[PDB]
Paper text:
The self-labeling protein tags (SLPs) [name], [name]-tag, and [name]-tag allow the covalent labeling of fusion proteins with synthetic molecules for applications in bioimaging and biotechnology. The three most popular SLPs are [name] (HT7),14 [name]-tag ([name]),15 and [name]-tag ([name])16. To guide the selection of an SLP–substrate pair and provide guidelines for the design of substrates, we report a systematic and comparative study of the labeling kinetics and substrate specificities of [name], [name]-tag, and [name]-tag. We complement these kinetic studies by reporting crystal structures of HT7 and [name] covalently labeled with rhodamine-based fluorophores, providing a detailed understanding of their substrate preferences.
HT7 was engineered from a bacterial dehalogenase ([name] from [name]), an enzyme that can hydrolyze halogenated alkanes. Inactivating the second catalytic step of its enzymatic reaction (mutation H272N in HT7) abolished the hydrolysis of the ester formed with an active site aspartate residue and created an SLP. HT7 reacts specifically with chloroalkane-PEG (CA) molecules resulting in covalent bonding of the alkane chain to the reactive aspartate and release of a chloride ion. In addition to the conventional α/β-hydrolase topology, HT7 features an extra capping domain made of six α-helices (Hlx4–9) that partially cover the catalytic site and form an entry channel for the CA substrate. After reaction, the PEG-alkane ligand is buried in the protein, while the xanthene moiety of the dye lays on the distorted α-helix 8 (Hlx8) in a conformation partially constrained by the crystal packing. The alkane-fluorophore is positioned by the Hlx6–turn–Hlx7–turn–Hlx8 motif of the HT7 capping domain from which T172Hlx8 and, to a lesser extent, T148Hlx6 form hydrogen bonds with the oxygen and the nitrogen of the amide bond linking PEG-alkane and fluorophore. CA-TMR and CA-CPY have similar conformations in both structures with only minor differences in their torsion angles. The direct comparison of [name] and HT7 reveals that HT7 features significantly higher labeling rate constants with various fluorescent rhodamine derivatives. These differences in reactivity can be explained by specific interactions of the rhodamine’s xanthene ring with selected surface residues of HT7. The mechanism underlying the equilibrium shift from the spirocyclic nonfluorescent to the zwitterionic fluorescent form is not yet fully understood, but our results indicate that the planar, zwitterionic form of rhodamines (e.g., TMR and CPY) features energetically favorable interactions with the HT7 surface, thus potentially favoring this state of the fluorophore when attached to the protein.
Numbering used by the authors: 3 to 295
Write the structure that this text describes.
Amino acid sequence: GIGTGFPFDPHYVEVLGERMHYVDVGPRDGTPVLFLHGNPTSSYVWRNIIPHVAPTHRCIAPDLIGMGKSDKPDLGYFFDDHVRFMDAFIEALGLEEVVLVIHDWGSALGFHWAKRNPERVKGIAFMEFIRPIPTWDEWPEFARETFQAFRTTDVGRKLIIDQNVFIEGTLPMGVVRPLTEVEMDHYREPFLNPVDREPLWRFPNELPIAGEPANIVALVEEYMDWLHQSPVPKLLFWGTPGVLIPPAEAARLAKSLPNCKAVDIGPGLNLLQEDNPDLIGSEIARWLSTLEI
Ligand SMILES: [Cl-]
């Protein structure tokens, strides 16, 4: 069965005055593979994928600021805050060239960093990634009213901050197979106190949906423009029915994005890592062996 444990030795680095935790396993030389999680997860979401890659490549998986075992400064936790912290995390570890493996808000961070630093990105593996959602009709109907309610300061904060719905509800509805109590407890751990749930509510308020927020839409459109032109090697995982990336969108992208290979993981919603970690891990490892790294 799918592993529930998190055996990785903790590492911490100081980044803009705050401590960030990260996983760091695998051989010291070579090009490192940088795994970036999204909302409402942490490096825990990569626990069953990293073991396929760590035999042959260094795997670095940070916890975003305010998440996982990272510190919880009093921020708004805008996407811009995550950009500043991830930029400085990357520099604090002295990373030069990397391969990215990215998901959800980690994908916005990784594509935005790669577009700004294309010489330092040797490949991107991505899944269930942030793209502009043109209208609410392109958000999955089964989740539409709740995401609309999340994007308010009254109902949305009641649900996500007071009641922890992003953890208790949205996270299971983003995984096809059932999550076990131990897994739920690993995801709950950083957010036991309601005040620490700020990032969980700011993230859905930052999603580029129906033109809002305009600044995030523009930034995401720009990295998608880059992705459609850049020769960077690309590996796209997708599932059925997906959430951010429906199967037809994935098929489009695989042919449209240069140097892109698509992998169907089977049934999946948003956290594809929880529905088929062994395929995702093994395919990343295989794909890495084809890159000039
Ligand atoms: Cl979100």
